[PDB]
Design a protein around this nucleic acid. Structure first.
Lengths: 386, 100, 131, 242, 52, 136
RNA sequence: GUGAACAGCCUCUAGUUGAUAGAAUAAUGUAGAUAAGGGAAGUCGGCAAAAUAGAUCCGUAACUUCGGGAUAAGGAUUGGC
RNA sequence: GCGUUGGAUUGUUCACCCACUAAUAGGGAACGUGAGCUGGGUUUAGACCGUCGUGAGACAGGUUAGUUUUACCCUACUGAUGAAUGUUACCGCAAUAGUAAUUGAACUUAGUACGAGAGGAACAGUUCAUUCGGAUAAUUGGUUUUUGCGGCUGUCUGAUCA
């Protein structure tokens, strides 16, 4: 026959196979190219996602039907502490791929990155770079050789960094390593930049700024072994069918006598690695700055941390990136923020936002007050106060 | 932005919170939350429900008539925006909350 | 959410409400408009035998005598006693528009109150005579 | 007597308000419709891009004359603040609360005499006479309920929709104290108030409005400087055919 | 209508990248590289305190 | 959108599917309207074409004048009673469903509209905004 | 005891505590439910489920072998002290 | 490469009408598809009618009622672990295989170009929606064994309490 009624396919064949990814930190697959005249610029940055909140905004969008009007929408807040450089890697171009040839480490490392290299910290004698730091004797003389190998060879230079998990209220004590490429020209100026940042921390505003389009990659929300009807979107069989109704009825034909690779079977849902692009930064706040949540309008001293904090997470007393929409991944997980991969063309990637009110009501219930000073004002006084 | 209160709750309703109902008589019923909204559907009486504010102003709780409670009324003439009015209203609203 | 609240209190199956019923008794015109309606074919009592308090059409004139003698209709009389709870009661509780609210409580105590209580006192005399 | 089109609609009184001392325009898209008012009016009166309750239909929500401007309840505080910043102090601007929101369909007026919907409350009827400085009369054009949509006024004259009886015209002109003609605009639209805007020295209408229809409108508002409106008898030859 | 990968729009979009929208990025990559130079100078001042 | 509809129609929730009896608001002489189809709809297997606030749908009169009855004619929805979203921070819903009957140009048929007309419909159709006594 | 009742539900005298168990809560099941707006557009077909129900009072059609139809339809009400 | 529908009568495909839409293109895969379903139809026993037959009975003429069994095995396919490369730990490279976006309107250009006449375009600039896909839970909605709090009926603990 000929199907009698055409319908689009269920599921996207681009994202095959649906399986559990290798680690809770997704690796970045591709970087922005190289603009080799520009100053040295770190391509990406990595932080911890923490909840969601609502933002109203006077929409400065010419041409729309909501020009010069107010728009409420939802944003995510990713906790973004400063990140410190500990290593330099160069890659040689081969006719096989890009082959790494040299790592250089930074003379003394924090307790966190030594915790990344063990799975039993409390038993180990903690001998991680102890024979390596001795190689920074009288003039080093090996590190100056291994730096000069990168200066001669090695068409691209990536920088090992790690986070500052001890500053985050998340209780896990173990930092994540990452590789981030540099985009400054003339690779000697790439590698002399990174040599001057050993044991040295890089802030957040020095990599992003407001009104910028970025893309976040993460590992998305494991749900376990899940049936076809909620996994692919197959229609339910009507009612009281023998042997089930949450399934696919016809799975193949007599020829070919093999189940095809595209017939929506049952299996894993979630905990995949995804890339979602064109996310727009609204606000780059600072941890030392009191009154982050105060706009130019509100004039109320308050921090974006809601009442009783975020749910399942501590407090944002750090630098943060407010970005609109919904980053894939859940709370207290690690995201990686690449920058735009190409020059964006549309007018939406050019508009300057001005936030008019930030919500900070409590997310553990129906939040009706911004600050605890509001609640004690509105309730009046209580028995336990006097 | 118009920080309007709940019709049943008399609690402040921030933008993006609660439901509005529109009667055929075209007055608006903006609600604090789903707790207050389903109490209005069931035709309950906010004079009798003890947790609302309309009970407490009526039944001899928290004071109703005051001098500071008359400042916040409404204005239907838009007084053209001098700065030195607005600079003192920030000193005014900080002071009225200290007295209330 | 439950079974029983969804049965009676959908938006489709909603009665008039306690605000508009108070305004109907507030004047002598709308009392005599609603009692002496023109006959209409869709309506249950063919546009006759209508109770003003409980906005509900009765089939027969005998179905008013049994309706006025009951704990359902005595309930709605006690419900319509005080100030009818507009939006202005809700905003005055927050500390907002007192003199808008204080003038309304002043008028309903002085002016509209005993005029409404006269209009209900003539309904109980009018429904007594026809029945 | 100018033809002007909002984006592709012949309706103008929906999308703009025009009195003797100001003008109000919508903000949609681009400044072609705003430029046509600057072609006629010049710099002599303020012309204001504004929205009413976050909408584009500002000619049917508001109502007013050269003395005052009335906005409905749903006008937000910023948009009420925006009107006073542009317009000078000679205009009174006041938010009015009612049952019915659209004041443009309900209040038709000149600088001197207003007409209202019958169901309007007398607590606003007092406010209309006080703000706008006019008299108020409760009347219906030909038993049609909205006096603002189906009639257009100035101090010069008045225009009504063609369902108006001749007996109804003679009664109603004693109230408004201006001459009255039954007419159509934009090729036979009954809604004559929404199709056009007019004050004492300018009329702006749609592109679909034909040249017999401009002859009626230029006559009754007396738009040239030496028109006593009696040239409608000279223009009766257009009227018998059209 | 025309698809995403048509030759007409991709020739049209290439001109806009030569014009306005690359100037905003090249203005952006100069402001951020300024703050990264002031990231070292704040962190060298705290190293001077321990030199005392 | 289509013909007669000025501007673009934003996304609001789909409340009225095929076979939905809705009240007739104007003074045309009908009592209720029966949706049979929605103009400007999609095409997907086993979906029902669902109307929303401010769409021109074909509607037959079930109860009213016999002149208006038994012929199909367009109708514009003015009240929804499904909760939809305004772009300022509120969800609102009306009390019932309602529609006024129209020509395919987008012009009204009667003189008056009773009850409140939706704000999303009043920006979209100017001839509805001309006859709207009550907006919102 | 509740109630029209040897109904159903709970208890006193009497009897039993037997039916392989322990830990976790994925899919699909079998058994039992609730769902915003629309109300049979689903389907061979309103299959199934929802709705109505006890009781007092008012009220009841075509037809008919004059006995019925009939709880026809339809409408008001129910606690406590 | 990408889409191709919603309904009415029939067990029916087919058939034709109503209606939307950019369009409602044609066909194959045992005239795809039963340890996937349905049992509507077809295909036993019961039974009534019409014709034929002396009669038992015939009619695939018409109409009612009629048992739907099994997967734990190998393989395919969607998922999940793992011995062996001195051990163990982190950061990576990409062979190959898969691939995804899609149509309709709107402002402006313009009532301009074009016309023996009325009527009546597009490219560049810009804003939204329809079908599909991937996520996310701020908000609104739905869900409740948090049996969290409160209430109610019958009963039981002498009553209150619980």
């Amino acid at each position: 026959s000929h199907r009698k009624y055409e319908a689009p396919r269920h599921g996207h064949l681009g994202f095959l196979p649906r399986k559990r990814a290798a680690s809770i930190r997704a690796r970045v697959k591709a970087f922005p190219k190289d603009d080799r005249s520009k100053p040295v610029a770190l391509t990406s940055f990595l932080g911890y996602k923490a909840g969601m909140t609502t933002i109203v905004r006077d929409l400065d969008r010419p041409g729309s039907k909501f020009h010069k009007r107010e728009v409420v929408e939802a944003v995510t807040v990713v906790d973004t502490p400063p990140v410190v450089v500990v290593g330099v890697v160069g890659y040689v171009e081969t006719p096989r791929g890009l082959r790494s040839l040299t790592t250089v480490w930074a003379e003394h490392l924090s307790d966190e990155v030594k915790r990344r290299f063990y799975k039993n910290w409390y038993k180990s004698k903690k001998k991680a770079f102890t024979k390596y730091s001795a190689k920074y004797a009288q003039d080093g003389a090996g590190i100056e050789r291994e730096l000069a190998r990168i200066k001669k060879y090695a068409s691209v230079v990536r920088v090992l960094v790690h986070t500052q998990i001890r500053k985050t209220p998340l209780a896990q004590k173990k930092a994540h390593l990452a590789e981030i490429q540099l985009n400054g020209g003339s690779i000697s100026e790439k590698v002399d930049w990174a040599r001057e940042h050993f044991e040295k921390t890089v802030a957040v505003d020095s990599v992003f700024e407001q009104n910028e389009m970025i893309d976040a990659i993460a590992v998305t929300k494991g749900h376990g072994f899940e049936g076809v009807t909620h996994r692919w979107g197959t229609k339910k069989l009507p009612r009281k069918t023998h042997r089930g109704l949450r399934k696919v009825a016809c799975i193949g034909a007599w020829h070919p006598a093999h189940v095809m690779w595209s017939v929506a079977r049952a299996g894993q849902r979630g905990y995949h690695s995804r890339t979602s692009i064109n996310h727009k930064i609204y606000r780059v706040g600072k941890g030392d700055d009191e009154a982050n949540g105060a706009t130019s309008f509100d004039r109320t001293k308050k921090t974006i941390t809601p009442m009783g904090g975020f749910v399942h997470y501590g407090e944002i007393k750090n630098d943060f990136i407010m970005v609109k929409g919904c980053i894939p991944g859940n709370r207290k997980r690690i995201v990686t923020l690449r920058k735009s991969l190409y020059t964006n063309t549309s007018r939406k990637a050019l508009e300057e936002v001005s936030l008019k009110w930030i919500d900070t009501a409590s997310k553990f219930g129906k939040g009706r007050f911004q600050t605890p000073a509001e609640k004690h004002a509105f309730m009046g006084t209580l028995k336990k106060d006097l | 932005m118009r920080i309007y209160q709940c019709h049943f709750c008399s609690s402040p309703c921030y933008p993006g919170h609660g439901i509005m109902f529109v009667r055929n008589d075209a007055k608006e019923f903006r609600f604090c939350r789903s707790k207050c909204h389903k109490a209005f559907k069931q035709r309950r009486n906010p004079r009798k429900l003890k947790w609302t504010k309309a009970f407490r102003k009526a039944a001899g709780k928290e004071l109703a008539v005051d001098s500071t409670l008359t400042f916040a009324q409404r204005r239907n003439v838009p007084v053209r925006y001098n700065r030195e009015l607005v600079a003192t209203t920030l000193k005014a609203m900080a002071r009225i909350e200290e007295i209330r | 959410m439950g079974r029983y609240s969804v049965k009676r209190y959908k938006t489709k199956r909603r009665t008039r409400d306690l605000d508009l019923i108070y305004n109907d008794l507030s004047t002598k015109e709308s009392v005599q408009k609603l009692l002496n309606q023109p006959l209409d074919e869709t309506k249950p009592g063919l546009g006759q035998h209508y109770c003003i308090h409980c906005a509900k059409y009765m089939e027969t004139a005998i179905a008013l005598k049994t309706h006025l003698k009951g704990k359902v209709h005595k309930r709605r009389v006690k419900e319509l006693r005080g100030v009818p709870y507009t939006q202005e009661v809700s905003d005055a509780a927050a500390g907002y528009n007192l003199n808008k609210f204080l003038n309304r409580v002043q008028e309903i105590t002085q002016s509209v109150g005993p005029e409404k209580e006269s209009n209900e006192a003539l309904l109980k005399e009018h429904l007594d005579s026809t029945l | 007597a100018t033809r002007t089109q909002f984006e592709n609609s012949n309706e103008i009184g929906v999308f703009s308000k025009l009195t003797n001392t100001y003008c109000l325009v919508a903000v949609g898209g681009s400044e072609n419709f705003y430029s046509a008012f600057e072609a006629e009016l010049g710099d002599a009166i303020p012309i204001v891009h504004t929205t009413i309750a976050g909408t584009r239909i500002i000619g049917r929500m508001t109502a007013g004359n050269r003395r005052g401007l009335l906005v409905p309840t749903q006008t937000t505080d910023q948009e009420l603040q925006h009107l006073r910043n542009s317009l000078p102090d000679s205009v009174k601007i006041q938010r009015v609360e009612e049952r019915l929101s659209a004041l443009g369909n309900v209040i038709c007026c000149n600088d001197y005499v207003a007409l209202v919907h019958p169901d309007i409350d007398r607590e606003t009827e007092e406010l209309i006479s006080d703000v706008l400085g006019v008299e108020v009369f409760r009347q219906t054009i030909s038993g049609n309920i909205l006096v603002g949509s189906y009639c257009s006024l100035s101090n010069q004259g008045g225009l009504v929709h063609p369902q108006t009886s001749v007996q109804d015209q003679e009664e109603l002109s004693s109230l408004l104290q201006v001459p009255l003609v039954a007419g159509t605009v934009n090729r036979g639209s009954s809604v004559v108030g929404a199709g056009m805007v007019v004050n004492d020295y300018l009329a702006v209408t749609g592109l679909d409005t034909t040249a017999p229809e401009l002859s009626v409108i230029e006559s009754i508002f007396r738009l040239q400087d030496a028109q006593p409106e009696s040239i409608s008898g000279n223009l009766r030859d257009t009227l018998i055919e059209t | 209508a025309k698809s995403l990968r048509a030759s007409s729009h991709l020739n049209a979009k290439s001109v806009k990248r030569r014009g306005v929208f690359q100037k905003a990025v090249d203005a952006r990559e100069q402001r951020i590289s300024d703050k990264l130079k002031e990231d070292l100078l704040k962190q060298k001042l705290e190293d001077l305190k321990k030199k005392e | 959108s289509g013909n007669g509809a000025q501007g673009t129609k934003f996304r609001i929730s789909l409340g009225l599917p095929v076979g939905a009896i809705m009240n007739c608001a104007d003074n045309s002489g009908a009592r209720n309207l029966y949706i049979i189809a929605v103009k400007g709809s999609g095409s997907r297997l086993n979906r029902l074409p669902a109307a929303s606030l401010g769409d021109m749908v074909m509607a037959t009169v079930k109860k009213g004048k016999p002149e208006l009855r038994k012929k199909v004619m367009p109708a514009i929805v003015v009240r929804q009673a499904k909760s939809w979203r305004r772009r300022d921070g509120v969800f609102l819903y009306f009390e019932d469903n309602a529609g006024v009957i129209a020509n395919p140009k987008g012009e009204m048929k009667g003189s008056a509209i009773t009850g409140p007309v939706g704000k999303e419909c009043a920006d979209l159709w100017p001839r509805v905004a001309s006859n709207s006594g009550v907006v919102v």
